[PDB]
Design an enzyme around this catalytic site. Structure first.
Site, PDB file in Angstrom:
ATOM      1  N   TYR A 207      -2.173  -0.657  10.902  1.00 58.60           N
ATOM      2  CA  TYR A 207      -2.235  -1.009   9.491  1.00 58.60           C
ATOM      3  C   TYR A 207      -1.039  -0.475   8.733  1.00 58.60           C
ATOM      4  O   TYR A 207      -0.445  -1.195   7.927  1.00 58.60           O
ATOM      5  CB  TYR A 207      -3.542  -0.506   8.871  1.00 58.60           C
ATOM      6  CG  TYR A 207      -3.644  -0.758   7.385  1.00 58.60           C
ATOM      7  CD1 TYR A 207      -3.878  -2.037   6.889  1.00 58.60           C
ATOM      8  CD2 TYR A 207      -3.538   0.281   6.474  1.00 58.60           C
ATOM      9  CE1 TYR A 207      -4.015  -2.268   5.528  1.00 58.60           C
ATOM     10  CE2 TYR A 207      -3.654   0.057   5.108  1.00 58.60           C
ATOM     11  CZ  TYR A 207      -3.910  -1.216   4.643  1.00 58.60           C
ATOM     12  OH  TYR A 207      -4.027  -1.436   3.306  1.00 58.60           O
TER      13      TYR A 207
ATOM     14  N   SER B 178       0.856  -1.199   0.000  1.00 54.90           N
ATOM     15  CA  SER B 178       0.000   0.000   0.000  1.00 54.90           C
ATOM     16  C   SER B 178       0.898   1.258   0.000  1.00 54.90           C
ATOM     17  O   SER B 178       2.069   1.161   0.373  1.00 54.90           O
ATOM     18  CB  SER B 178      -0.825   0.037   1.289  1.00 54.90           C
ATOM     19  OG  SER B 178      -1.562   1.235   1.466  1.00 54.90           O
TER      20      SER B 178
HETATM   21  N1  LIG Z   1      -8.462  -1.291  -1.036  1.00 58.14           N
HETATM   22  C1  LIG Z   1      -7.566  -0.373  -0.699  1.00 58.14           C
HETATM   23  O1  LIG Z   1      -7.876   0.781  -0.347  1.00 58.14           O
HETATM   24  C2  LIG Z   1      -6.124  -0.775  -0.720  1.00 58.14           C
HETATM   25  C3  LIG Z   1      -5.111   0.101  -1.085  1.00 58.14           C
HETATM   26  C4  LIG Z   1      -3.788  -0.299  -1.003  1.00 58.14           C
HETATM   27  C5  LIG Z   1      -3.494  -1.567  -0.563  1.00 58.14           C
HETATM   28  N2  LIG Z   1      -4.493  -2.424  -0.273  1.00 58.14           N
HETATM   29  C6  LIG Z   1      -4.166  -3.847   0.044  1.00 58.14           C
HETATM   30  O2  LIG Z   1      -4.686  -4.664  -0.966  1.00 58.14           O
HETATM   31  C7  LIG Z   1      -5.053  -5.942  -0.408  1.00 58.14           C
HETATM   32  C8  LIG Z   1      -6.430  -6.336  -0.874  1.00 58.14           C
HETATM   33  O3  LIG Z   1      -7.394  -5.375  -0.407  1.00 58.14           O
HETATM   34  P1  LIG Z   1      -8.781  -5.250  -1.191  1.00 58.14           P
HETATM   35  O4  LIG Z   1      -9.123  -3.818  -1.386  1.00 58.14           O
HETATM   36  O5  LIG Z   1      -8.729  -6.154  -2.369  1.00 58.14           O
HETATM   37  O6  LIG Z   1      -9.787  -5.860  -0.104  1.00 58.14           O
HETATM   38  P2  LIG Z   1     -11.210  -6.590  -0.195  1.00 58.14           P
HETATM   39  O7  LIG Z   1     -11.961  -6.335   1.062  1.00 58.14           O
HETATM   40  O8  LIG Z   1     -11.839  -6.278  -1.498  1.00 58.14           O
HETATM   41  O9  LIG Z   1     -10.754  -8.119  -0.291  1.00 58.14           O
HETATM   42  C9  LIG Z   1      -9.671  -8.650   0.495  1.00 58.14           C
HETATM   43  C10 LIG Z   1      -9.858 -10.142   0.473  1.00 58.14           C
HETATM   44  O10 LIG Z   1      -8.979 -10.755   1.444  1.00 58.14           O
HETATM   45  C11 LIG Z   1      -9.706 -11.755   2.121  1.00 58.14           C
HETATM   46  N3  LIG Z   1      -9.079 -12.016   3.412  1.00 58.14           N
HETATM   47  C12 LIG Z   1      -9.182 -11.255   4.548  1.00 58.14           C
HETATM   48  N4  LIG Z   1      -8.688 -11.824   5.622  1.00 58.14           N
HETATM   49  C13 LIG Z   1      -8.224 -13.047   5.160  1.00 58.14           C
HETATM   50  C14 LIG Z   1      -7.614 -14.138   5.810  1.00 58.14           C
HETATM   51  N5  LIG Z   1      -7.466 -14.227   7.136  1.00 58.14           N
HETATM   52  N6  LIG Z   1      -7.269 -15.205   5.054  1.00 58.14           N
HETATM   53  C15 LIG Z   1      -7.541 -15.180   3.747  1.00 58.14           C
HETATM   54  N7  LIG Z   1      -8.125 -14.218   3.029  1.00 58.14           N
HETATM   55  C16 LIG Z   1      -8.451 -13.175   3.798  1.00 58.14           C
HETATM   56  C17 LIG Z   1     -11.132 -11.218   2.204  1.00 58.14           C
HETATM   57  O11 LIG Z   1     -12.130 -12.199   2.485  1.00 58.14           O
HETATM   58  C18 LIG Z   1     -11.285 -10.597   0.813  1.00 58.14           C
HETATM   59  O12 LIG Z   1     -11.835 -11.494  -0.149  1.00 58.14           O
HETATM   60  C19 LIG Z   1      -4.847  -5.824   1.106  1.00 58.14           C
HETATM   61  O13 LIG Z   1      -3.592  -6.396   1.457  1.00 58.14           O
HETATM   62  C20 LIG Z   1      -4.833  -4.317   1.335  1.00 58.14           C
HETATM   63  O14 LIG Z   1      -3.954  -3.915   2.373  1.00 58.14           O
HETATM   64  C21 LIG Z   1      -5.782  -2.054  -0.331  1.00 58.14           C
HETATM   65  O1  LIG Z   2      -5.934   0.729   2.338  1.00 62.92           O
HETATM   66  C1  LIG Z   2      -5.014   1.476   2.048  1.00 62.92           C
HETATM   67  O2  LIG Z   2      -3.787   1.052   1.906  1.00 62.92           O
HETATM   68  C2  LIG Z   2      -5.203   2.955   1.860  1.00 62.92           C
HETATM   69  C3  LIG Z   2      -4.412   3.583   0.922  1.00 62.92           C
HETATM   70  C4  LIG Z   2      -4.438   4.956   0.761  1.00 62.92           C
HETATM   71  C5  LIG Z   2      -5.290   5.736   1.503  1.00 62.92           C
HETATM   72  N1  LIG Z   2      -5.347   7.147   1.425  1.00 62.92           N
HETATM   73  S1  LIG Z   2      -4.952   8.051   0.128  1.00 62.92           S
HETATM   74  O3  LIG Z   2      -5.183   7.254  -1.036  1.00 62.92           O
HETATM   75  O4  LIG Z   2      -5.658   9.287   0.287  1.00 62.92           O
HETATM   76  C6  LIG Z   2      -3.219   8.376   0.228  1.00 62.92           C
HETATM   77  C7  LIG Z   2      -2.566   8.952  -0.851  1.00 62.92           C
HETATM   78  C8  LIG Z   2      -1.210   9.203  -0.771  1.00 62.92           C
HETATM   79  C9  LIG Z   2      -0.508   8.871   0.376  1.00 62.92           C
HETATM   80 CL1  LIG Z   2       1.183   9.271   0.473  1.00 62.92          CL
HETATM   81  C10 LIG Z   2      -1.164   8.261   1.439  1.00 62.92           C
HETATM   82 CL2  LIG Z   2      -0.284   7.708   2.830  1.00 62.92          CL
HETATM   83  C11 LIG Z   2      -2.526   8.027   1.380  1.00 62.92           C
HETATM   84  C12 LIG Z   2      -6.153   5.124   2.461  1.00 62.92           C
HETATM   85  N2  LIG Z   2      -7.017   5.934   3.143  1.00 62.92           N
HETATM   86  C13 LIG Z   2      -7.820   5.363   4.023  1.00 62.92           C
HETATM   87  C14 LIG Z   2      -7.837   4.009   4.299  1.00 62.92           C
HETATM   88  C15 LIG Z   2      -6.985   3.191   3.626  1.00 62.92           C
HETATM   89  C16 LIG Z   2      -6.104   3.725   2.660  1.00 62.92           C
END
Ligand SMILES: NC(=O)c1ccc[n+]([C@@H]2O[C@H](COP(=O)([O-])OP(=O)(O)OC[C@H]3O[C@@H](n4cnc5c(N)ncnc54)[C@H](O)[C@@H]3O)[C@@H](O)[C@H]2O)c1
Ligand SMILES: O=C(O)c1ccc(NS(=O)(=O)c2ccc(Cl)c(Cl)c2)c2ncccc12
Ligand SMILES: NC(=O)c1ccc[n+]([C@@H]2O[C@H](COP(=O)([O-])OP(=O)(O)OC[C@H]3O[C@@H](n4cnc5c(N)ncnc54)[C@H](O)[C@@H]3O)[C@@H](O)[C@H]2O)c1
Ligand SMILES: O=C(O)c1ccc(NS(=O)(=O)c2ccc(Cl)c(Cl)c2)c2ncccc12
Lengths: 280, 260
Positions: free
Chosen positions: A182, A169
């Site tokens: 997180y 992320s």
């Molecule tokens: N969505 C965002 O804002 C965002 C941004 C950057 C990074 N990420 C990362 O991307 C990844 C995926 O997020 P997403 O947006 O696809 O989420 P999501 O909620 O769409 O799906 C995540 C999936 O992971 C599964 N999961 C959760 N706990 C689990 C466990 N114990 N064992 C196996 N599977 C499990 C859930 O059931 C779900 O299907 C995460 O690692 C998250 O940190 C998300």
């Molecule tokens: O789930 C996540 O990883 C996640 C990723 C990004 C988020 N915020 S953002 O996109 O506005 C942003 C843009 C640039 C920077 Cl430097 C940063 Cl730190 C953050 C965010 N916000 C709330 C809950 C989860 C997330």
């Protein structure tokens, strides 16, 4: 601020001009026939990454705690022409992972591409978080990466061929208020990918590649709102492009590698060095 | 090279304001040896009240004996800083016998050098428990009084590892990267909440000759002595420096590393 804004503007112009000179065709590889294991594939980034790999003609293995969702993903991947095997695996549980790898080897084979996507988040200020949530964040977001990689890595090292994709992320590079556990687990994911890359290089393992997916807020329902005032399918396309070109640090969107080196150089002589150190 | 010469000039020509930590209740984890032990000695010279924690009872008492020779009041507690229950119970003891801690130095740490496939799961978990999870429980326990009094300082002893990886130290580098993350987000959350009185510092030294590990990962010929890192940390804390690198010039090398 008057002269500082114009110094950053001239910086960003020459940075996106250096990445444009180096932009000559990066080679795209084939992942057809590769065994790909995607964790957290029952929804979001994971689900759409599975669809991208299905179009790529890969052999899919999908993991998730959500049995219904992972089967719904597999059904649509099978419609795309791919062979898919789904496993209800808790990716924060060391025992569950180790036992499920024994199942994967028996029913599918030796995994060649691992996408550590599964993740959890419990938004709250530090004193409103629960210890149960803090531990669960670390178990799924980073500890799980260690056990699945430890299980799948021996065969990759044997065949000098593999790819470890760590979905982290923007959080793994910059903090966000109300997301301390997180952000910490995501910073650990960046660290894990980083040290793994250097250890693989140090050991002489030329055939195992690594990628790190660092997207900004994605509209997957993972969290209700972005921290600062991006569609799921775009992040899947960005990750597949990164993997096929062996990109180590994949930012979604790409230009965020720039915004990050705008906070880190934010004394007057700190940006001053980043000027003549880049134009050479 | 040039930035470190200019930083040496700014450090003398325009010195940053130093604050007083006299009478402050300082809790140092992993104070039975090394960085922790020498940080305790620096705080003792600073006329602070000390609460020293460590799994090594003998070492923490040997440290307290020297802090007492320096003129400070010290209380030691044999606390396992990777154990949530132990920390929570020991904070109840600290409040009963000493008071409300105002400066927390999360220094306790562990390391089990090995390539990924030679590490033991027991060691990987223990690395996370002491190096980052422990930071969460001790901070969660000590923060409510700091927020009430709008006054405190959370010092997170991380490593250069929290910024750059090292082969054969994957779990350790990951836990240290998490420590940097915890400090960075803590800083921004305190700022977001409007808490102006609680400061944060992050100690990121290179290899220090404390026997924590047998050798440095790279050819560092002027090796870091333990007492130097203690002086660097006390200077950082007294000047409210958020990201303290030991030696200081690593900030430009690491910023420079992030290209091509
Ligand atoms: N969505 C965002 O804002 C965002 C941004 C950057 C990074 N990420 C990362 O991307 C990844 C995926 O997020 P997403 O947006 O696809 O989420 P999501 O909620 O769409 O799906 C995540 C999936 O992971 C599964 N999961 C959760 N706990 C689990 C466990 N114990 N064992 C196996 N599977 C499990 C859930 O059931 C779900 O299907 C995460 O690692 C998250 O940190 C998300
Ligand atoms: O789930 C996540 O990883 C996640 C990723 C990004 C988020 N915020 S953002 O996109 O506005 C942003 C843009 C640039 C920077 Cl430097 C940063 Cl730190 C953050 C965010 N916000 C709330 C809950 C989860 C997330
Ligand atoms: N020494 C280095 O080269 C180096 C470099 C950068 C950062 N660091 C960090 O600095 C810190 C101190 O390292 P050091 O070289 O002073 O170590 P050290 O070996 O001198 O002593 C560390 C102390 O931590 C204590 N400790 C370990 N686990 C504990 C637990 N669960 N509860 C309580 N106390 C515990 C040990 O008993 C020991 O007294 C660590 O966090 C380490 O990551 C070390
Ligand atoms: O225990 C530690 O934290 C520790 C800190 C630094 C080490 N290596 S170093 O000083 O050569 C160095 C210099 C610069 C950078 Cl960027 C990096 Cl990553 C590393 C080291 N080596 C072996 C075992 C533990 C450590």
């Amino acid at each position: 601020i008057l002269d500082l804004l114009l110094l950053l503007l001239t910086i960003i112009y020459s940075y996106l001009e250096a990445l444009v000179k180096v932009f000559f065709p990066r080679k795209r590889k084939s992942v057809a026939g590769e065994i790909v294991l995607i964790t957290g594939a029952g929804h979001g980034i994971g689900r759409w990454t599975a669809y991208e790999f299905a179009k790529q003609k890969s052999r899919l293995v999908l993991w998730d705690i959500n049995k219904h969702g992972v089967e719904e993903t597999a059904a649509e991947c099978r419609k795309l022409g791919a062979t898919v095997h789904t496993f209800v695996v808790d990716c924060g549980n060391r025992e569950d992972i180790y036992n499920s790898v024994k199942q994967v080897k028996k029913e599918v084979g030796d995994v060649t591409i691992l996408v550590n996507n599964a993740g959890t988040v419990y938004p709250a200020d530090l004193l409103s978080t629960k210890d149960e949530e803090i531990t669960k964040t670390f178990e799924i977001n980073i500890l799980g990466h260690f056990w699945i990689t430890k299980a799948l890595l021996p065969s990759m090292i044997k065949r000098n061929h593999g790819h470890i994709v760590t979905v982290a992320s923007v959080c793994g590079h910059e903090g966000i208020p109300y997301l301390i556990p997180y952000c910490s687990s995501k910073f650990a994911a960046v660290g894990f990918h980083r040290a793994l890359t250097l250890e693989l290089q140090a050991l002489g393992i030329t055939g195992i590649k690594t990628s790190c997916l660092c997207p900004v807020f994605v509209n997957t329902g993972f969290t209700k709102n972005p921290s600062t005032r991006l569609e799921t399918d775009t992040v899947a396309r960005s990750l597949i492009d990164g993997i096929l070109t062996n990109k180590k640090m994949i930012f979604v969107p790409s230009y965020y590698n720039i915004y990050l080196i705008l906070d880190k150089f934010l004394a007057l002589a700190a940006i001053n060095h980043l000027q003549n150190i880049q134009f050479e």
